[PDB]
Subunit: 107 residues, 5 copies
C-alpha cells in the first residue's frame, strides 16, 4: 500500500502529479444527462474533472467518485489549500484520481 | 468533454447561461407529493428550480439531482457567490442543469 | 410549477403557511421504532414535525423527507432565519411540507 | 404523535431522559467488526452509545441510526449544547434513542 | 460493550492505541481502482490509512468505513484535535479501527 499521493500515482499508467499548493479558484457541477461531472480550475488556468461514471470504472470506484465531488465542493467553499492532485492525462480535462491537502507543510 | 459551464451548456438544446455573480437570496425546498423540488431566487426576482425527478431524467442523473440540491442549500447558507447557472429554458421557472462558482474572478 | 412556497401550498388540501421570520429554537430527532421523526420548535411556542415515513407518502417523497431533516438540522445549528413553513394541518403537531429561507428579505 | 422528547420517551419500555444542558466532551467512532458504533461522553462522566445495528432494529431505524451518528459528530465539532437525551437503560452504556438541542432555553 | 477507545482496542488481536492529542497534518484520498482509500499524517511523521474495503471486512463494516473517511476529512478541515487512534498493526501504514476526539481533556 502506498503511504502518499506520489507513490500512489506511480502505480498507474497515464497519470501525473500536479503540485498546486493553492486553493481552488472555481468549482462547477452539472446534472445534465451524460455530463454528470464536476470541473475545477486554479487561478493560473489549470483545469480538472471528476469523470462521469462509466465503463472505465470498476464498482468500488462509484462511491469514491461521489466522495471526491463532495471533497472538492467543501474544499472550494472553505478555501482549503490543495497540495497535489494525481490525475490521468489521457483525458481532457485531466481526470482526478487522488487529492492531498496539507495546509501547514513548508514548501 | 467540456472545460467550462458555457461550453457544457452549448451541447444541449433549449438551454441558456445566466450570469449572476451574486449570492442566493432565498432557498425553498419541498417534500410535498409530486413537488419534491427546490427553488432559489436572487435579490431582484430571478428564479430557478431543480426539477422534480421524472421520466425526462435518466438514472445517471438521479444522484446528481440530489447533489445539486445539496450544493444550493450550502451555497445559500454560506452566502457563496454564484458565478453562472446553465438552465433549460423550456421550463418555468428555469430548470438548473449546472452551476459554477468562482469567488475571486474579476468581473468586467 | 410554483415559483414560491405560498403558491406551492395553495396546490394542496389541508395546508397552510406559517410565517416565522426567526431561527429554530429547538431541534429534536429520534431513531426509536415507529417514531423515526424530527420535531422543531420556535421561541413563540410553535411546534412542527417531519412525519414518520408511512403509507400516506409516495416513493418520490422518501428522499425528500430525509433531506428535510438534514435541512432543519443544519438550519438549527447555523441559526439560519426561517421565513415560512408550509404545513399539513390535519396532523398534530403540524407536519412540514416545505420550508423557505430568505435572510435579507425586508419586513 | 409526541410533541417533545419527554413524551416520546414515555411511550417506550426501558427508557429514561437525561437532562444534560451541555456540549459533548468526547466523540468516539469505530469501524471494527461487530463494534460499528459511536460513543459520546460528557464532562460529568456520563457515557452513551449509538448501538451497533442488529435484529432488535426494524428496517425503518437503519437510516435513523446513521443520521443519529451524523448528528452527534456535527454536534461534537460545533460544540452545540445538548439539552436532553432519551436512552435505553437496558444496555450499558445506555443506548441513545433520541436527542434534543435547544441553545437559548433557560436552565 | 466497551465505554472507551482503549477498552475497545483490547478486544481485538493485532491492535494498538496511538495517543496523538493533535490535529491532522495532511489528508489524502483516492478514487483510483483498487486504491479507494484515505491516508492521514500527523506532524510527528506518523501515517495512517483507512483501508480499501475488502474480503477482510464483514458487510456491517462497509458503512462504517465510509463514515470514518467522512470523519477524517471533516476533522482535517476544522483542525479538530484527535485524541487517540485505535489501529491494526499488521498493515502498513497502520489501518485505522477507531478514533476518539476530546478537545477539552487535560493531558
Ligand atoms: O479508473 C478510471 C481510469 O480508467 C483508465 O482505464 C483510464 O485510462 C483513465 O483515464 C481513467 O478513466
Ligand atoms: O434532463 C432534464 C431535461 O430533459 C429534457 O428532455 C427537457 O427538455 C428539459 O427541460 C429537462 O427537463
Ligand atoms: O404526503 C404527506 C401528506 O399526505 C396526506 O395524504 C396527509 O393527509 C397529510 O397529512 C400528509 O401526511
Ligand atoms: O430498537 C432498539 C431497542 O430495541 C429494544 O428491543 C431493546 O430493548 C433496546 O435496548 C433497544 O436496543
Ligand atoms: O476488519 C478489518 C481487519 O481485519 C483483520 O482480520 C485484519 O487482520 C486487520 O488488519 C484488518 O484488516
Ligand atoms: Cl494502470
Ligand atoms: Cl477526453
Ligand atoms: Cl392534496
Ligand atoms: Cl416499547
Ligand atoms: Cl480479533
Amino acid at each position: 500500500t502506498p503511504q502518499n499521493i506520489t507513490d500512489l500515482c506511480a502505480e498507474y499508467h497515464n497519470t501525473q502529479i500536479h503540485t498546486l499548493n493553492d486553493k481552488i479558484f472555481s468549482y462547477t457541477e452539472s446534472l445534465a444527462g451524460k455530463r454528470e461531472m464536476a470541473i475545477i480550475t486554479f487561478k493560473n488556468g489549470a483545469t480538472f474533472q471528476v469523470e462521469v461514471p462509466g465503463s472505465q470504472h470498476i464498482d468500488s470506484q462509484k462511491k469514491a467518485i461521489e466522495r471526491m465531488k463532495d471533497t472538492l465542493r467543501i474544499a472550494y467553499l472553505t478555501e482549503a489549500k490543495v497540495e497535489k492532485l494525481c490525475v490521468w492525462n489521457n483525458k481532457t480535462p485531466h481526470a482526478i484520481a487522488a487529492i492531498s491537502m496539507a495546509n501547514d507543510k513548508k514548501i
